[PDB]
Design a protein around this ligand. Structure first.
Ligand SMILES: [Cl-]
Ligand SMILES: [Cl-]
Ligand SMILES: [Mn+2]
Ligand SMILES: [Mn+2]
Ligand SMILES: [Mn+2]
Ligand SMILES: [Mn+2]
Ligand SMILES: [Mn+2]
Ligand SMILES: [Mn+2]
Lengths: 272, 266
């Protein structure tokens, strides 16, 4: 597993080298689900490299990958060591040069996350986390905040790529509910992987979002939990990777409270 | 003027250094006009340490400073060389160790911003602009994006510190209108000044906010316009320091497109 993980960190840095080299140049910006669901040649290029490169040394292992699934692969997850890959997390950021794009990699066996590597290449920040062996940014150990007063909280969330009116409605409302507790504020840097690493550093108290996929939070989640945080469903349930819903917080107290206040948005899971 | 400027930039790198040693220490936090409207001792100390070092070299000059206006002094602008300080722009970030906190300084003469300096200290990014002489972060020249299609644009905005329900609803409602235009996305890093500098760079296309102040926008503003961008009132009408509402966009096409869509909060 340190073999598998030590390889990932090295792969992450390469992918990263590619993405932040790409970010300087002419972009080939295509569509996916909609006029707002974006992708570039770089997304695909990187995902392919990451997969061939892993598959080569571990042909036993399976892969869930954002764009692979999007060319008709399937996000059914098993007990085979799966590699869960978002090649560029923050594709709209990437397309805009808004300076937070992350390469996210997450290793699962028996349907549990062993280790995650999130590399934020513009920042020059590599976050890692092995189960039981802590979480780090660039060699430096991380710890979540100590806050339990919801009303002294800083939250991060995203508005989501969806523009379906009944969903945007629900989204902004949930935000308003939380904002009017009041909390100290809400941030959105543009990428789930990073919004969550920021929670790991204790820069922010809690991240939550409905609409995310398993590849967005496979990597960043074990970093948060290993930074001493917690993950949950927006129901107050334990976190489900395929639920498409996540609360990632410094503690159970804060997580429990955000859970109470927001409404559960209808989205179909990654396992359906 | 370039001596006043290079002066500010030293001041700023220096205040930023205080700010950024401070950040990594436990803090007593104090409220001002609401329970989410914060200040700590450092906003105050840094501001004094700024105002005093300037008048101690420029004693002929007027000052507008965020925290000083709080503890008493008067927010009226004249044509006299006026330094306009926001000692820590992003106190909630500061208080939270959220890594976007800036020192900001605008120098206006005849109520005109001659130059701006905005130091985002955790980042090590010193933004500076001079009317006529262009915009730079760390010696690298800045230039806004070229996007003229609101449907392909990424906006930065801010939810505000007002928790007044009608003030709140209008914020999220405007956000909803724009979001559904649709635009590529909307972003918040927690500070007017860095939000505006992110627009100077081209990483974002416009930024809008109602309820800002003098000191919030007095350094970044010239940085936006010197990188090619425009400042605007949210009303589509002209921008002046005292207006309390701005749109900083790459171009007028986008600015006016935003103005068309958002209801002005009073
Ligand atoms: Cl993505
Ligand atoms: Cl402030
Ligand atoms: Mn992606
Ligand atoms: Mn993603
Ligand atoms: Mn994507
Ligand atoms: Mn303040
Ligand atoms: Mn301030
Ligand atoms: Mn401010």
């Amino acid at each position: 597993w340190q073999e598998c993980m030590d390889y990932a960190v090295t792969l992450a840095r390469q992918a990263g080298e590619v993405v932040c080299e790409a970010i300087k140049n002419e972009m080939n910006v295509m569509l996916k689900s909609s006029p707002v669901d974006l992708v570039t040649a770089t997304d695909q290029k990187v995902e392919k490299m990451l997969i061939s490169s892993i598959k080569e040394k571990y042909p036993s292992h399976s892969f869930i990958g954002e764009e692979s699934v999007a060319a008709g692969e399937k996000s059914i997850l098993t007990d085979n060591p799966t590699w869960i890959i978002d090649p560029i997390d923050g594709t709209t950021n990437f397309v805009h040069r808004f300076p937070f794009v992350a390469v996210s990699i997450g290793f699962a066996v028996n349907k549990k996350i062993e280790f995650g590597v999130v590399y934020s290449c513009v920042e020059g920040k590599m976050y890692t986390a092995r189960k039981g062996k802590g979480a780090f940014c660039n060699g430096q150990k991380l710890q979540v905040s100590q806050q339990e007063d919801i009303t002294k909280s800083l939250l991060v969330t995203e508005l989501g790529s969806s523009r379906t009116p009944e969903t945007v409605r629900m989204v902004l409302s949930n935000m308003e509910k939380l904002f009017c507790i009041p909390v100290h504020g809400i941030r959105s840097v543009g990428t789930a992987a990073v919004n969550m690493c920021l929670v790991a550093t204790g820069g922010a108290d809690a991240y939550y979002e409905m609409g995310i996929h398993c590849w967005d939070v496979a990597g960043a989640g074990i970093i948060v939990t290993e930074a001493g945080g917690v993950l949950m469903d927006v129901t107050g349930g334990p976190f489900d990777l395929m639920s498409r819903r996540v609360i990632a917080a410094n503690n159970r107290i804060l997580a429990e409270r955000i859970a109470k206040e927001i409404q559960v948005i209808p989205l179909q899971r990654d396992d359906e």
